[model samples]
Target: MKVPMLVLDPALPANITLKDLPSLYPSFHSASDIFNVAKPKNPSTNVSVVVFDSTKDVEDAHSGLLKGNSRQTVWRGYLTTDKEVPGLVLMQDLAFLSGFPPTFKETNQLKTKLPENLSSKVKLLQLYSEASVALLKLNNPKDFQELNKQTKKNMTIDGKELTISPAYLLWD
Candidate 1:
């Protein structure tokens, strides 16, 4: 299992909280994939703990979201993997998908939902059906590049808008 913990500094609102420190720092208040995004109950400076659902997400958010700018530092609290795969991406939000157990879905079944080009070019790996997030690995590097270029990020599958992000690793 891969779990990561983060502590924001300069302290966030000890009383209340909102998106970002003020409203433009790419905060953790809006991730649909976090396990727990809340501050400590005992009330401490920078006591906020932003725990993520997966190891990749934590790394993605840290470098992609809070790596630069802002005033939050380690003065209050500091910040901080797994044996999985490489060059993988995460496709999220596949609600109402046809499945037997209702909460479970397979990767190959997900491929049919993709465009024909990507259907065979992509390799299905693991998936977190309870959250409708699937981990995908492209069969070839060229295909990965083609995917990034063609898909341009968001891909609509079976009328369901799905978002893809760096997972396991983007370049493998």
Candidate 2:
């Protein structure tokens, strides 16, 4: 069965936009899907989010501003407001099943070194298995950013080396 997924109440930042580019960052005209990045002429870091028919189309709300003709400060992750560390309200973008849920078999692709608490949270999200995802209301943005730094992986997944693309997630 196709796993379930959930959409977040969170909305894309007002400064961000999307587009269909001939190519994405570091590549040109060779990719079928390319979302341009431009923030007031500033080179914004763009993150491509695959949309699912089953999920709500929030992208349209930001149209005209999207389709590679505009720019923004938000990507697929989170950015919060808290001291000590940078905010990570966009971390939610890295969530599993960004648009849909994953089957039990597919869940095996997750790394084995996650924290126990985090693992439990992920498993809980998996239990729904129907276009649902897990999210936490963080009181501090640093917690999110710190977790991001720790959970970063640049190696293989399911025996294949994964590609880690750059997104101005940490950019100012």
Candidate 3:
């Protein structure tokens, strides 16, 4: 069996049947609403969302930041309870789905086919809110830089990390 990677684009499709528009979006409902990339196994699949933004001219924007077109420093760090630690860069693989159950072997990891166009880095300018029901607010450059650094940690919320069963959320 092959795993389906739900690739979503920033647009409204012709298939979605919006039952209640007011209850969901009382504000300005635009024609090009953002599409979320999620799976059917999600409990709140209707609301579970993944938010992202991308610009076509990233190289131009990056070039403007370089002083005299010289070498630049890129840092990755994570904010801990009291210390700031550098984080690891993870290569994202959605050849498999997560945050769900019924973990059947869809494809053999040893022989699974890799995506031809899967190499890229994701950059976020700000703390992207609205993906969750609640919001997390931190200070400026320091806040985001710290948060960015922390996400790559071998984290254990109260000594354990969240597994496929959310073991970390139950920690003290």
Candidate 4:
């Protein structure tokens, strides 16, 4: 199986309907079998995913949409607490999604409140929040840079570096 084309465009309209995606990009007309949007409560995000049966189709859409912008990052890594520690960066992402401050204190409090069975959903939200932050930084550099610098501190959880995920360079 081939990996689907993941498009993370902050400039896109938040209330966009899935049906309208093909209208926006003709490549999506026959390429996607699954087209969905993960709209978060946060007004700052609108993440869309398009899954195509053919790798070439998705790759075409990726290039067509991004238009060769290397500054934008793509994150498709699995976020799971089972058999792995939910590292600090991911925890921060979770906090950000839950409308919290995305601080270490907030994530820790959430951990105590949440059940172990819901780890998968929580981690998915974590990835969403991380993408949200990346979009925010891309849209507004100065403000986000200042905030990122402050929030990007060194830390660790279960031998995994928390700072690794927040770097936004790797999918983490």
Candidate 5:
């Protein structure tokens, strides 16, 4: 499932036009699947809303903006204010399946770890399995990047090295 979020950057005010928003984070625009700059109706909000699709986009934005005054001034949340609605649904489903009511902490831990687990070794292996044949044929183009770009293998999953393109990513 794709995670969507709203990131509030204090450096960006509500008065700025949407066309100018890309200038704030060029790297984010290039890395993300979907991104939008939103301005609240209230000009005094003194905040800019960045809607992003991928978690990597959030991390990239966080790293990109961390250099200056905007360093620690970012706030993020799911698209909905009641973020636990999804958690509640998951808990309900788990309860039904396991015949035991799951606690809120259990639900929270499940919700939190779901993303991390998916984004880690398992997903990386799947990506490598799907793309490795094509990538090796392409001479491991330098433009492609992986999580462990500097390593010989991207990751080892299930006691096997799932290597993708063997090229260093060109990060500017």
Candidate 6:
């Protein structure tokens, strides 16, 4: 599933105008999908969220902004909050799937259902048949970024949910 990410910038107010919103996010071709250029869901952040309809777009904004070192911030989820530990990198855009109901069969079946919503061609880096746990290598990042949004506790599988998470946690 494509994830709609929230972009927050302190410089912009909660009551921002839609016309002005486009400039903050040049990554989008059009501004129609940018919704709720409004207040913080959590006031403590002292920021406002500019709703983006596509995860791929948000990923582009994050990458490009980093390349240009722009001030605006984009978020994927609850993990990152501060700039601590300055730099982090991974060889590939990676994530693992878990919580597969024991009823699941061969890894081949998983390749069909887990990333069913994904538009990008994903690489099954490895699959431990003994355990339902598996890995995916995101080549055209947007493919991974596209599925990145499917963080629901359950995937659309045999009445049970399977979810994906950033591979960074593999070490944790």
Candidate 6 or 1, higher lDDT: 6
Query: Model 5, 22-114: lDDT tens per residue?
Result: 666554563322222322334444443344546766677666666656543555543221223434221100000111112222333323332
Best by TM-score: 6
TM-score, each model?
Answer: 0.33, 0.22, 0.18, 0.33, 0.31, 0.38
Measured by lDDT, the strongest candidate is 6
Order candidates by TM-score, high to low.
6, 1, 4, 5, 2, 3
The candidate with the higher TM-score, 1 or 6, is: 6
Q: Give candidate 2's TM-score.
A: 0.22
Per residue, candidate 3 scores C-alpha lDDT tens digits across 1-172 of: 1111112112333344333322333221222223333332343433212222222232232333346643222221121121222332221111111221222233232122211111122221122132211112112322333334344433222333321110000011
The pairs that clash in candidate 6 are 154-161, 155-162
Cα TM-score of candidate 5: 0.31
TM-score winner, 5 or 6: 6
Which runs in model 6 stand beyond 4 Å of their true positions? 1-91, 118-120, 149-154, 169-172
**lDDT assessment of candidate 5:** 0.34
Q: Model 1 residue 109 lDDT?
A: 64
For model 5, where is the 10-residue window of minimal lDDT? 90-99
* Candidate 3 overall lDDT versus native: 0.24
**In terms of TM-score, how similar is model 6 to the real structure?**
0.38
Give lDDT for model 6.
Answer: 0.50
Model 1 Cα lDDT, one tens digit per residue, 1-172: 2325444444445444444433544645434422222233333433333435555655555564454665554322211113254443332211112222333466556656665544554545446656564544453444555454464544556455554444332221
| Candidate 2 per-residue C-alpha lDDT over 30-143 given as tens digits, one digit per residue, 9 for 90 to 100 | 222212222312234323332223323334322323456433322332222233344422443233322222432333444353334244333321313344343222223334
How high is the lDDT of residue 108 in model 2? 42
Task: Give the candidates in order of lDDT, highest first.
Answer: 6, 1, 4, 5, 2, 3
Model-by-model lDDT, in order?
Answer: 0.42, 0.31, 0.24, 0.38, 0.34, 0.50
Instruction: Tell me the deviation in Å of residue 120 in model 1.
Output: 2.5
Better candidate by lDDT, 2 or 4:
4
